[PDB]
Structures are given as structure tokens and as C-alpha cells.
Amino acid sequence: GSMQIFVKFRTGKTYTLEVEPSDTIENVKAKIQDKLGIPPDQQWLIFAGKRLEDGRTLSDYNIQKESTLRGVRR
Questions:
Q1: Staple 29 to which of 8, 20, 38, 40, CB 3.0 to 4.6 Å?
Q2: Any stretches that span the bilayer, and where are they?
Q3: Domain 1-74 architecture
Q4: Domain segments of the chain as ranges
């Protein structure tokens, strides 16, 4: 399946991201590289005051449609 989420940076700039509940955190970073040109190794993703773990799925973190991830430049 698919859902739309958001990713927000310290600029305030908030981008849509098209994901799937089964996606791993690494896969989400890969999508961010495709959209924004930020390599995975240069990214952290934060939700609910946690840094999301690379091998966990979006479904594990209970990420819903229209949820906002916070992107951090590594």
C-alpha cells in the first residue's frame, strides 16, 4: 500500500514524501535522496522525539498518513 507523509527541515520547508508502511527507514532515506538530493548517509530522521532506527519499518513506528518526519542533516 502507499501513503503520503511529510518531511520538515530546519528551514521550516516541509515536503511531501510518498511511502509505504512496509518501508524500512533506509528506504525512506532513499526516497528523500531521489526527491531532495540528500544521500542517506547524510540523513537522520526523527519522529516522536526519537531517531528512527534504520532497519525498523514505518509501520513499527506507527507512522500515519500526513504524519511529519523531522529531517536532520548529518
A1: 40
A2: none
A3: Roll (3.10)
A4: 1-74
